Design a protein around this ligand. Structure first.
Ligand SMILES: [Cl-]
Ligand SMILES: [Cl-]
Ligand SMILES: [Cl-]
Ligand SMILES: [Cl-]
Lengths: 406, 406, 406, 406
């Protein structure tokens, strides 16, 4: 069983770049034929064992009976790549190429959402950086609740698709969008802070369940498979009376330490906001007594995560436009020294006459948050010194949302 | 694009066992359609994040236009498994099953090769063990140079296939044989002791190169892909004058610490044996001055490996049937206190009137080897105490080769 | 500032064994002078970096103005040991010795408490083992609630000291007892199952707090410092009305997954037993509705711990001497599929006409417990197969408590 | 045996800062009494187990019979610290304090040596940084061959002490100098690139041996013990004829991958430079055929190190003031594709009319070096893109040596 005759790779034994199109030729290709890569690399000098990866499905761009076009992937080191035709069980070697390094930079960079031009813009990167500054966001202009999973070199967020809110990943390497959910279930919110996963609260049926929607990214066949369907084995829960899905998802939810309780905020019809807690075992409940002009959940990562119990302090940024608490207050959500109930603590930071519009975390730091104010200002708060520190390069900032990412 | 209509899984929402056949039905299946699994598991109590795996190709056993039979895999924990039809790009969910635990036992067990019945036999396991004792070896009755890669729950070795020696993996879960090399190149020897890989010296063309032949096992799509083609980026080397491939491979080669030099032994036409060293950068050379009646390379693992620099002492067991050194001597190969050259050290252990016929390592111990003698006896040597300790259960042992494995 | 003159080590440049006495001589020693070790080792062949340890305080056995006797420690590899005189700030090298390997065997072994002879006995070890079988327990004949912290090569438990129950470590290497608590506070119980620590509930003042009492063992100056004082920063709690300290501590408590809730059992005056839960944030509460003839908490470790979130299923073994539930029932404690409250589940294993008197865990296995019955029988239950498997070597067993240890 | 009466800590139960003096009082203190700390911390919310450390020797600043002054250490998180009096065996608790966070920032920062003012200056740190900019270098104004061990928050280098070159650590937290060698042996050079250790070539006796001189820093009692004495168990080697110690140490040596061969450069009397290799098993040898106007060894770290086999490409920067190779050439030292001998490769980067005066590595990047030129310019070379990238903030730079550090 020879799969194809007079076959090969046009670019055989040449050096090719991540993102390039490689061409395969031959007689006898069939509908459903797939293409696999095997990678071999040496990071420094060659030693046994080397670095190995395979089989990794190749993205097929064009397809005919006389050949096919495939795309070379990013995110591998410089590699000897062997290209195989895969017909069900069988594999046949077509040829080899040398693939130039496609590893993504690991330094954290700040990105802003430009709603005027509908673009993601790189707002800050540390010195000796100038790759490519802007990404077109016009395929999903409503991109919302934007967050980063460390090392993915792209952004996760919510956007309208088939009449509901769904999670997408924007890949910085290609500028392409990848759906993260298998089914078309409406998504209340993304949830960050677990440690090394992005979760989402989605409508599994009559009610809402907690899903892992980043598992397709943290996995070696990402290129050909990104949609996940991983709900928790817990019951579904309805929203409390009065509340509707459109009231959620403007800001990411946050896992409390232990990852059992999730902090959300909901926007009421009259423009006021309430804190809302979610327990995947018990459901939704409103944290009573607070109705403010803006509420954003946050967390401080008190140690570096490992890609295990991720240690953190979480809370709500609470903003009032007027009165005795005019401005933005940052208050931790912690259990009472008396007993079980979760109570909002007195503020550890308060900024009168300033409105917080975005919060995000640089994960190569510990115990800090990065905040975007308007009167625009970008500033870090360090938990251990209890002091703010402004970014002096970043006063223009024509953005309502910014996000740290690598 | 709905792939198939009136489709599903016969065993949908039921509990199935690893090794079972699951049936898929529907109208519109096509040649080349594949099937993918996504796994979700909770080892203890459920917490976010859970355990996830996917896509993992399913082995397809039977195939028609109205449906297909697939085999459920071993080596995953108890999992919710979602089954997808994969037609090139597209995926469609067919159904879900609960897959019972398929994790393999991690305790080290001793296995012997029975050349009379052509079977692998479990010779020793520690208390409270009685699973399944024997495996049929008749598909490859010449199975040779048998070794284990820790945690694979099976045995690697050499056997004749298409007129040459090639590496195979015998899977203990199924009793099935998997080819480890993609091409049909003759294999001089398997090489163990790197830390977490099995290598092989194979004829890449005019000469011999060093390959990694276990990479297909240490990889999540093992079930549908096991053959590797991973030579080192080093030149090919011919054997020294006089020597031929049939003289090698009776015993596994051993990596010295640093994994640059490999110890081999070769059998001459007259029944004598010589030590032979191999450097993947420089080629083959005979360690001069020794011609004995049996030579087996060995290593001591002086720390537990991590699945990084694996620390060890290596050498040759040298056996003479008569004379002043009658019996089996164990001598380390180390560099001279004077300069570079590798010299055989004086023995650290010597057994007169006993012939060593197999050596193997239990990797949950440190600094020991396990040895099989004939006058049969099985005994451990502990480097730190310099003492032998016999296994009292294991005097019968109708085997010439035994191997520790998990 | 030369500390001492005409000084040295009697055994300078010689090979010495762990446990040996080494002698130091010189003029000018002072009260309070200490002795430090620096260790250098090569596990396999020498490479940079080597293995290093230092300063490690030496145990001083005898002391005079003309010299001192020190004990060489166990638990290091074969090492070049440099011996330093330490006078406050200053250090002076006295000499060097070669210390033979003192690493303790890592294979799990079963030990029984012999109350007749007041001895710890090795009841089981796997083949090729015969070191030293018995340890004298007469210094603490009431040694109770015996458990192992993996890799410590000794046993932790409770014994009477200064009129109260306190934690001790019996070191297998020396047969010597080490106190684990700094203060003389009464100990209700040891608590196991956290992952890599032994906790204890102790009377910090008016009430009880949770302590870590193994931290002194998991620390490189263990030889000279073992007593810890590490309470949690949580309030103290009294026992519920009626209960008294003498009712606790016969069996180790067990951490539920997440390490927030602890399972205990308490013996009433009339010989009946009740389950008692402890929350370090909220205090003690009786798990109502159960009054049995014996109750022992247990856990299954569902993955190997790392020395992170340790995954497990925990519960109570509940024994009744008569009636519809005659015998020993094993029931998990889990939260209801309905809501928050912790409920005892229906049994996953039940043994009529057999009384469980000890439960313990072999941590190189996953998902098993080891149980000791009387009609004596020793048997493993495997969570994944739901089957018992008896140890056929272990029917005599003149013990009420057995413990797995390495 | 009560050690001291009417004793306590002046600052008992108060919050104190790293670097502060804490006072201990009482009657009956003795010469040689030491003081130990035990630390307990919770990074996020409290959970069992917490973070623990102890015993950690306290630095004693003042000492009398009625009390003592101790310094509170840096580099721990915010901790409950219990303070113990240590008299030989015995310990007594004196009191407790709350120690504010002393963790050092982990972001890499660039530091320059100012030979005019004799100061270490912080030349670059990324945004939102302004701690303390300058450190006084006047205690060792000849500080030379300056390097960083990651996470130490200070600088290692060579300086004159007792008539010879010796390694010192300058601690950024305190500005204090710590000796790294126990004995007063002349040091040819520091050697970097092993992965997580700083080595040094030092005169052990008649000849030179390889030492680990950073082990005292990577160790929890660093505060009271920094001097190491850890030579390799290899013979001593003399320098080749003609060469003298004053010709070495201007630049750090570099370990080749595998850490067996070390690259050095030596300055001749006439101002010319030669490459010199060192093998700890075989000794020194000149890499013949090269005599240049400046030579600096370097390495590229091709992966992040783990604090295992550190992968890297190493070589020599070779500078000529005139001729066909005017300027600075960067050439790897690799083994020939033909055989064993180490040959200088053709340059991978060449800068005509620019002189390299310092090279250093930012270890949160991979595959880069940072270089300081004069015509001053600071620039990164990225191995994977083969492109330079200048730091635009750093043109003034009144330094001959700069170093990346955290
Ligand atoms: Cl056994
Ligand atoms: Cl009572
Ligand atoms: Cl910057
Ligand atoms: Cl000269």
């Amino acid at each position: 069983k020879i799969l194809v005759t007079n076959a090969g790779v046009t670019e055989a034994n040449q050096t090719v770049k991540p993102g390039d199109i490689v061409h395969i030729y031959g007689d006898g290709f069939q509908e459903g034929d797939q293409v696999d890569f095997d990678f071999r690399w040496d990071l420094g000098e060659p030693l046994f064992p080397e670095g190995y990866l395979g089989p990794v499905g190749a993205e097929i761009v064009e397809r005919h009976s006389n050949g096919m076009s495939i795309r070379m992937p990013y995110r591998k080191p410089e590699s000897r790549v062997e290209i195989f035709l895969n017909r069900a069980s069988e594999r046949m070697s077509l040829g080899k190429v040398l693939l130039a390094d496609g590893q993504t930079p690991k330094d954290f960079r700040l990105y802003g959402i430009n709603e005027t031009d509908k673009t993601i813009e790189r707002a800050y990167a540390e010195e000796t950086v100038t790759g490519k500054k802007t990404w077109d966001m016009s395929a999903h202009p409503d991109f919302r609740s934007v967050v980063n999973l460390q090392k993915t070199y792209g952004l996760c967020g919510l956007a309208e698709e088939n009449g509901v809110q769904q999670p997408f990943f924007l890949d910085f390497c290609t500028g392409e969008w990848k759906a993260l959910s298998f089914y078309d279930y409406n998504t209340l919110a993304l949830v960050i802070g677990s440690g090394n996963d992005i979760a989402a609260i989605q409508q599994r049926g009559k009610g809402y369940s907690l899903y892992n929607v980043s598992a397709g990214l943290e996995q070696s066949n990402y290129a050909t498979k990104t949609r996940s369907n991983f709900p928790m084995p817990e019951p579904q829960f309805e929203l409390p009376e009065g509340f509707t899905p459109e009231q959620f998802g403007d800001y990411p939810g946050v896992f409390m330490q232990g990852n059992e309780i999730i902090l959300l905020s909901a926007r009421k019809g009259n423009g006021k906001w309430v804190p809302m807690l979610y327990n995947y075992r018990n459901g939704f409940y409103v944290l009573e007594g607070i109705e403010a002009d803006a509420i954003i959940p946050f967390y401080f990562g008190m140690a570096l995560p490992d890609s295990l119990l991720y240690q953190k302090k979480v809370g709500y940024m609470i903003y009032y436009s007027s009165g005795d608490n005019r401005g933005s207050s940052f208050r931790l959500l912690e259990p009472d020294k008396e007993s079980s109930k979760l109570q909002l603590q007195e503020p550890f930071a308060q900024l009168s006459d300033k409105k917080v519009v975005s919060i995000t975390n640089r994960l190569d730091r510990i115990g800090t948050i990065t905040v975007l104010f308007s009167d625009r200002t970008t500033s870090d708060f360090d938990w251990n010194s209890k002091e703010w520190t402004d970014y002096t390069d970043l006063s223009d900032m024509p953005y309502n949302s910014v996000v740290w990412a690598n």
